[PDB]
Amino acid sequence: IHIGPGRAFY
Amino acid sequence: SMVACETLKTKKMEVQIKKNFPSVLQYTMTDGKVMYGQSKDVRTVEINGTNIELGDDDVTFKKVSDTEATYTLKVKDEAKKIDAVITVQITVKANQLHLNVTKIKNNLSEGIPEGNGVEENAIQTLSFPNQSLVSVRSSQENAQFTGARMSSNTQKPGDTNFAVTEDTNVTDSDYTYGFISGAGLSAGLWSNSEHDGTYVAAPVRGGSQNTRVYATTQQTGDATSLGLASAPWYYHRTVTDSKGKKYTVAETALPQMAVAIAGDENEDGAVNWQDGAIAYRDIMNNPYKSEEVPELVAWRIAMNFGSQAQNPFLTTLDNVKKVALNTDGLGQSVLLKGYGNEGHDSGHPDYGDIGQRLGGADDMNTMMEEGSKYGARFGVHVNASEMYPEAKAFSEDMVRRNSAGGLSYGWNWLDQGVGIDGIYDLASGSRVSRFADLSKEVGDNMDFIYLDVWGNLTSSGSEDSWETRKMSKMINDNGWRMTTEWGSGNEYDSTFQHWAADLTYGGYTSKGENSEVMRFLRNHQKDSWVGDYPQYGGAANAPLLGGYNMKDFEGWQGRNDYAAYIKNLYTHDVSTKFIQHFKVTRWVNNPLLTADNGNAAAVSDPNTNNGNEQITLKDSNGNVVVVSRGSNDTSSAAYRQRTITFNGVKVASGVVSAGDGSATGDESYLLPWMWDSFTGKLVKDSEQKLYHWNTKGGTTTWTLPDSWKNLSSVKVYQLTDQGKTNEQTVAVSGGKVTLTADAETPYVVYKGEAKQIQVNWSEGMHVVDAGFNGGSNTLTDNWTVSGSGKAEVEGDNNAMLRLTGKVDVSQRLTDLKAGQKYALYVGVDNRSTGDASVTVTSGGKVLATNSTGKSIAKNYIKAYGHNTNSNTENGSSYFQNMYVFFTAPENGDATVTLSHKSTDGAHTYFDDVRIVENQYSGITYEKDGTLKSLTNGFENNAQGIWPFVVSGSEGVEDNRIHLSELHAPFTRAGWDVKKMDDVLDGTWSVKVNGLTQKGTLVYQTIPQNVKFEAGAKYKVSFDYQSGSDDIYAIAVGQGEYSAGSVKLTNLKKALGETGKAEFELTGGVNGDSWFGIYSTATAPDLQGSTGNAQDFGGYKDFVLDNLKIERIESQTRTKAEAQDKVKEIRGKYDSKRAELSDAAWQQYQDTLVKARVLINKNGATAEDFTKAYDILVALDEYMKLKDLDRKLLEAARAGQDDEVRILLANGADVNTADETGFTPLHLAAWEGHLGIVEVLLKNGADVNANDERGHTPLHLAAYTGHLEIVEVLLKNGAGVNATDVIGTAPLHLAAMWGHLEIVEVLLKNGADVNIQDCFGKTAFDISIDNGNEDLAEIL
Ligand SMILES: [Mn+2]
Ligand SMILES: [Mn+2]
Ligand SMILES: [Mn+2]
Ligand SMILES: [Mn+2]
């Protein structure tokens, strides 16, 4: 699942 | 010589009666069997809770005849202010004895003073304590007591069954029904007592607790005697209203009681309550019009809400004809919820106010008169507990007040509901005069009244049986059948309970009547029982008698599935109703009754149905119905297996599909329908029919009824919305028939060829088949199709007209008043880019015309047939009403044409052609067909909030937007805590109630209502009232609404003083321009108001009136000027290609290409050059703001505190979102720019703003590890327990990394540790999975 405007997963 | 007793006698019995008191010694039947009365010298009379024992000189006696005697009782008590003379008559007929109090004389008053004033020393209550009218002894063979109390709980029976032994000890033990059996005789006691007592389960009052029988034990020699007496009666009861005003109200009826002596009435070889119950039916009260209940196969609600007119009366009549065709003419019961005022929960308590937008009293009467021909009964939803300031009945005396002297507030939705003072409403004669107002309108056409919420205590803390009886009387006096909401409510006079018939409501503890005694006696008289709903268990697990299962298809709770409605009628309702045509005679082996629930002496027989449950029912023509349970064990598959026999022949077999819609069954039936749909009399041998249903489908063999045994063949028809179809001739061999059926498909069986039910679609509607219910044939018989394209009747739910290509659909208009003004509107969903039109012509001359391009607004009306949850096409519906206004010609010749111009291939959907008398004359046109001016004061709206349409701020809802009505001073600012006016000019306005902080469109104009020409300029103005500053804004857009494509202008506060708004609009290139009302993200100023004052104050509301849209003169431009403006705009934004989004470039390119088409067309004029220039100016102003917004999102991300301030001061929107939904606040919190976060919030950035993944700026700040930003966001009012699409809170994100102090500040601010994501993980589980033992240590 994505969280930010970049390529950050969680 | 002088004897102390007399004998009253009939052909069936002799009775000894005492001369010194109205007591019976014993009843002797012709066979010699004896039943005792009162063997002891008990002469007690209770008045106003005081017992007075009478002496020999206090009673005088007179024998009138062998069947009647009269008593005069002198009841005096100086100390307790009692001095009365009571006249009592004892009558006997057949096996019945009646004891009636025929006169009550008060020697202490001159009666009730005028206006229901307080009668001092009034006889309020009266009873005969331990009168023992009928009694059983412990010394008698099978001495038993059977009682019933009210139970709405499916797990708790309302019955008690026990043996009368020496240890039996009761004193005024109160029951709704009581039966005593002993020494071969059984008897029940009937009373008209309004006493409320002991009950098993009931969630409300409203006559749920009515106990009419008192059981008492006394010693009779060495035996214990259990005697039955009436519960106390009310006579001249003194009541108090909410203001402390006292009133004396006269009796509903004089005191009455009766007994009926039975032997073995069902000839089953035993004497119990069931025998006494068969006899009891001869003496018991029968609800008014209960005789028609078996005929009401098809119950349903036709819904109207918030000025929308979703179901006008003449549309309801069409739906009645559709259901008649599909049921082969079975009886119907239609509840009109929203018949009055603006619809449902509007205009209460104005019963006489029939909704003018539905067609008023004239169309309501046509529907009722014409519908009666099809066996349809009509009734209206009324409220006697809550009122609205708009209602003419609203007054200071009508208002329910609390101890403090404030309003007793109800619910706020469209308007603020206020509790009615129920005691004042009754005692002043107010309610009875409002019902009289309705009676004057409907005459003898209406069948029932539906009383909502009575018993929930919103009118007063009482709403007892005495109150319910007076209520039921004023309704029944007007020729109306009584129906009510709650399952337990009004046991005495109700024939229907909404929470009984609709099994989905309120759970197992708040259903219909769970009593074997009550359902034995009255199953055939009411729809007030427990039906199938396995989920609830107990009584709801496959009742043998079934029970009504109510569904709807006309908007009630957004219900619109017609196929599901019909399927349901056949699954449960046809057999329930078939069973109700017979009266219960025997009921053995009930598995719900056990020794543990006080039913040790319950009726058992191991020689009947293997000791499993069986019910025997009989009619007056000696027809026997036997209903059997397969097994009495719930863990056995056979518990749900039921066999129904009609005269010893199997007519039904199997398991029904679960009433809760959870599991399909296997039940099949071939039910004989012998009755007409009127008074349910037997039809002729020719008209006799059978209904066939097979749940799973397949082939079944049946024995036909006795009258059918010698036929050689039968005629079988499949039932559809078109009537009888696919006729089959089926052979009869040995009185047996084999039937092949499709799964869940209705069939009707006749002896010979059956005629089609005659239906003339849309009677009184000036057009034939206005709703397209006539099938494919309607386009040949009623409507005329012309053109190269296709016209089709589409939709397997609510049928619509579907057009493709160049096609016209026409029909002549009938019964129009010459010279009279009419509105013609039609539902339209256009998916084609080509114009969909509606035209009214008179001999090839256009009277009025209107058209629409591609539809841009989805329908959000829950109660409407074509809302966006119904799927007109591609999972959506854009249905909206398109109007034409015309004057009917003197000529008498008028035609309606619905048409499509394109050859697009895309569809246009049309439905519900409505021609109605209407005085709206606010539209003026230019020389060319275009708009000059549109004015609207909303005084003449045929329907809805036209020229506006409801938007999706609440999704598909019973939208809190409607036309508000004037009723001064109650609707005006200043009355109570009300700070806003409901109406600004005239009688009507457009009111928005509490739709604040939605961050979306509330309502909008659409091009089919008001067309703005491309490049043309318009002045829009209106009068308004807004609760707070910037809570609502004027929205201006083009095409379908999308967040971030609308021009917004915040409206200032105008609370109690009318504001004036005016702006200019330039029509977009595609002609799809519109304006509307938008709910901003701004919080309302409640001005320190608390509780209901927050909603009634008007701080959260918006009122609009006196709308004026006028085409304005713009500064004339030359081709040169327009060409230079093209160059100017191109010079600015041609380069900016990469900067703006791909959707923004195509919007810029489109507008630029279309403006150049206007400029460079051969023979273009000054108007074309002015339009092209104005389009470019509006394009420039749009692109300028779009650039500023893009620059603001880049300055908030890069960390430029200066640029952010500059851009905000110039014009850039603080709440601008990128493609993925990130606001500048999101970007500032993520990147870590504390100053920028503070700057944006100071300006007014949304702190609870969500991106596409549901992440708020707090989620982004918690994940990254920005303590500073986390704290400043929470300070501003950020949601601490805000969850994204996976249900992840900021607490989970902080636990994921190990941001200890972020977890601390979150927990300090109120972060819930119990919050679970979609995968059931807490913040605790997420910390242990990442290897952070230090975080898990806390909790
Ligand atoms: Mn019997
Ligand atoms: Mn239709
Ligand atoms: Mn007005
Ligand atoms: Mn209203």
PDB file of C-alpha atoms and ligand atoms in Angstrom, chain B residues 346 390 414-415 962-965, ligand 4:
ATOM      1  CA  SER B 346     -43.536  17.040   5.926  1.00  0.00           C
ATOM      2  CA  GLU B 390     -44.923  24.804   8.503  1.00  0.00           C
ATOM      3  CA  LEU B 414     -35.867  18.602   6.307  1.00  0.00           C
ATOM      4  CA  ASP B 415     -37.092  20.734   9.259  1.00  0.00           C
ATOM      5  CA  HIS B 962     -36.832  20.696  -0.294  1.00  0.00           C
ATOM      6  CA  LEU B 963     -39.273  23.570  -0.840  1.00  0.00           C
ATOM      7  CA  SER B 964     -39.843  25.234   2.571  1.00  0.00           C
ATOM      8  CA  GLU B 965     -43.355  26.600   3.338  1.00  0.00           C
TER       9      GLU B 965
HETATM   10 MN    MN C   4     -40.515  21.930   5.168  1.00  0.00          MN
END
